């Protein structure tokens, strides 16, 4: 889907397999966090289905012993001063010494500020001990979390459930067309892109000689010249688009290890899975009731959230016994209005706009001339796009194709995809929802200077789910967007005593970094909110509490109370409503039983299981159940009669006997049992069909074939 899911598919520990456990018969003690996982396996990232606890992710600093055990680095402390030697330990040794906590107050000389410290004992128990018998310390915080989890700002303010949800949802975002970098984030974005391998990195220092949209030619310092080719609009494994764009000029000088070209979800070397949007937190007319989201119409006009999806089709040229199937443009007796695109070989041309039902490659079959039938590849229902490229493999050119086939054709179709109702959005803190409405720009709440907001979130889901990292991210995002400058005329204020230099002033659209377990304390945020640069006019839109005065787009009257406004990072998940809508009135039927097929690739019906039958029997509806179970599903003579009755406008006839009952009777007889259906007075009923009217009325295919003229 994106580089992060690829980097996380490896570095993955599975408990299932040959010689391991069973998915259903696992238990409840093997799905638990053991006190020996600190630093070796992440306790947050795991599936939330029936695989919970049986799959995990390796930590960041961990490494594997030659024997097969996992080690972590610890920094050795001698005689109360924290040294700088690093030693790798396994759980066996780790459960023997006393190991301190990651964020202890070292006093720039190695001695602890406070005598009491939290440590972990032999049995994994935590306790408060005087700082005299410790002999190890953690190398850094974030050493207990995985690589997907270390990319959440303000992680310590979120409960375990929502943190797990956000870490799992970060791997489903699709690559957009622009992919701008986050305004507020952690420092793990840069190393998660280079190591995944989606970007081009120069191997040796030199001066770039030539730049284009396809290749980059680099002239080294010893006369050697190296040219890098780039992949443009290539299909991924899941249908998304993989692209690479240069980010260097024609005279710049590069260095060994510098990023030269971007990738799918990369911006200037950093991972960028979403967009920055202006957010107000308030209920609004019930359109965001129960986790729904309200969007603006500017995100549709300006292609803020738009993605390219590519699909592939294929055909085979077989050697049928009665002849040999061939690819040609002589489809039996078809109007030439449909052969307009197929040039001469029967293969569609590049750039044509296809629709549902059209022809991609024309093929014929020998019936056993006067035997040519039409079996050509056609676009299935619900597809469109522009043909991007055709790849043809032939037997007469040494190409190794399997015996029986002699010509392969592969046609790629691509389409752009905008945002709409039903598409799923999510954030990094566990918020997720579908889009309930898209409003015009002219009727969204707007600030004092007339800037509309971009997305409205409800306020009833924030406190009872215990994920308040989003409001803090909102405040810090607004502060980073508008900039700040601390007035340090008389010394430095008390609350900014710990802030480093270069962080007391920031220009608009700055980018800041908040590591996972040591970042901006709440006092610093409260202080920064009170000193923010004004807009182009001498105005401040957001006061000291993080709230603003909004007008109403429909009535014009200002809202009576101020509302929380900020900037939030929103990503577009890969659950699109364009691939989830299905309907069917009549289609293909199965073979052993005459029930309708199942699935979406073929026209498939919806299952009506046991629980729905129980509900219908509780309602007392006896005719609806009988009509659902006989004429709509299985009664082979009743279906055509019902269709004729509906078309002619007459009454629906009576049902018959489903074929599954007869199949069951045949099985029971074949198991050497004597099953009989009797009448009121013996005389077992024959139950052996009868002479019906074979004349196919209405002269129409029931629907197994759509329509051939």
């Amino acid at each position: 889907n994106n580089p992060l899911s690829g980097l996380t598919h490896k570095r993955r520990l599975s408990a299932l397999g040959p010689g391991g456990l069973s998915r259903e018969r696992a238990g409840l003690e093997v799905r638990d966090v053991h006190p020996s996982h600190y630093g070796r396996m992440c306790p947050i990232e795991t599936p939330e289905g029936p695989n919970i606890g049986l799959i995990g992710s390796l930590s960041v600093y961990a490494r594997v012993n030659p024997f097969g055990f996992i080690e972590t680095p610890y920094r050795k402390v001698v005689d109360g001063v924290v040294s700088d030697e690093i030693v790798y330990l396994t759980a066996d040794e780790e459960d023997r010494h006393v190991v301190a906590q990651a964020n202890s107050p070292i006093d720039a000389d190695g001695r602890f500020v406070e005598p009491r410290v939290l440590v972990r004992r032999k049995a994994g128990e935590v306790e408060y001990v005087p700082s005299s018998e410790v002999d190890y310390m953690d190398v850094s915080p974030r050493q207990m979390v995985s690589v997907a989890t270390a990319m959440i700002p303000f992680l310590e303010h979120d409960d375990a459930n929502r943190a797990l949800m956000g870490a799992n949802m970060q791997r489903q975002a699709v690559p957009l067309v622009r992919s701008e970098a986050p305004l507020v984030g952690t420092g793990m974005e840069l190393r998660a892109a280079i190591d995944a391998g989606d970007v081009v990195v120069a191997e040796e220092s030199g001066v770039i000689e030539e730049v284009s949209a396809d290749y980059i030619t680099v002239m080294h310092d010893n006369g050697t010249r190296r040219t890098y080719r780039m992949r443009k609009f290539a299909r991924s494994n899941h249908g998304t688009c993989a692209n690479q764009c240069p980010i260097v000029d024609a005279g710049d000088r590069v260095e060994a290890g510098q990023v030269i070209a971007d990738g799918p979800c990369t911006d200037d070397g950093e991972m960028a899975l979403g967009k920055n949007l202006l957010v107000a937190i308030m209920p609004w007319e019930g359109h965001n009731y129960e986790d729904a989201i309200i969007l603006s119409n500017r995100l549709v006009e300006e292609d803020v959230l738009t993605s390219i999806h590519i699909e592939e089709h294929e055909i085979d040229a077989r050697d049928t016994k009665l002849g040999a199937e061939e690819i040609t443009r002589d489809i039996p007796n078809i109007s030439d209005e449909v052969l307009a695109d197929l040039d001469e070989r029967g293969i569609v041309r590049i750039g044509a706009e296809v629709r549902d039902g059209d022809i991609l490659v024309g093929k014929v079959t020998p019936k056993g001339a006067r035997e040519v039938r039409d079996t050509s590849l056609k676009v299935p229902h619900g597809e469109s796009g522009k043909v991007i490229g055709i790849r043809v493999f032939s037997r007469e050119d040494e190409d190794e194709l399997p015996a029986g086939v002699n010509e392969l054709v592969r046609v790629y179709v691509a389409q752009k995809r905008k945002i709409s109702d039903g598409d799923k959005l999510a954030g990094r803190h566990g918020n997720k929802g579908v889009i309930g409405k898209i409003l015009p720009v002219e009727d969204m709440p707007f600030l004092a200077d007339g800037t509309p907001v971009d997305i409205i979130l409800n306020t009833h889901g924030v406190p009872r789910r215990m994920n308040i990292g989003q409001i803090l991210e909102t405040h810090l995002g607004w502060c980073a967007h508008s900039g700040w400058k601390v007035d340090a005329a008389k010394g430095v204020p008390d609350w900014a005593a710990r802030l480093p230099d270069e962080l007391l002033e920031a220009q608009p659209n700055a980018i800041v970094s908040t590591p996972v377990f040591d970042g901006a304390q709440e006092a610093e945020l409260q202080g920064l909110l009170s000193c923010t640069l004004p807009n182009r006019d001498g105005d401040v839109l957001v006061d000291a509490d993080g709230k603003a005065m909004l007008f109403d787009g429909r009535s014009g009257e200002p809202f009576p109370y101020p509302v929380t406004v900020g900037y939030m990072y929103i990503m577009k998940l890969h659950h699109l409503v364009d691939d989830k809508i299905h309907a069917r009135s009549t289609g293909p039927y199965s073979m052993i039983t005459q029930q309708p097929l199942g699935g979406k690739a073929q026209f498939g019906g919806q299952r009506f299981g046991e629980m729905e039958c129980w509900a219908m029997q509780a309602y007392g509806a006896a005719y609806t159940l009988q009509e659902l179970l006989t004429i709509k599903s299985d009664d082979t003579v009743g279906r055509v009669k019902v269709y004729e009755a509906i078309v002619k406008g007459e009454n629906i006839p009576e049902p018959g006997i489903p074929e599954s009952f007869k199949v069951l009777l045949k099985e029971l007889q074949s198991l050497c049992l004597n099953v009989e259906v009797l009448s009121s007075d013996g005389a077992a009923i024959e139950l052996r069909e009868g002479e019906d009217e074979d004349l196919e009325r209405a002269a129409a295919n029931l629907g197994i074939n759509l329509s051939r003229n």
């Binding site: 680095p73 915080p141 420092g187 260095e255 070397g269 962080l503 700055a510």
Partner: peptide, 21 residues
């Protein structure tokens, strides 16, 4: 740092890391 052309992103962190990823 330690990346020849990384974009500048100032951090709020107070601790010092002795070991790199």
């Amino acid at each position: 740092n330690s990346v020849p052309g990384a974009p500048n992103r100032v951090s709020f962190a107070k601790l010092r890391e002795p070991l790199e990823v």
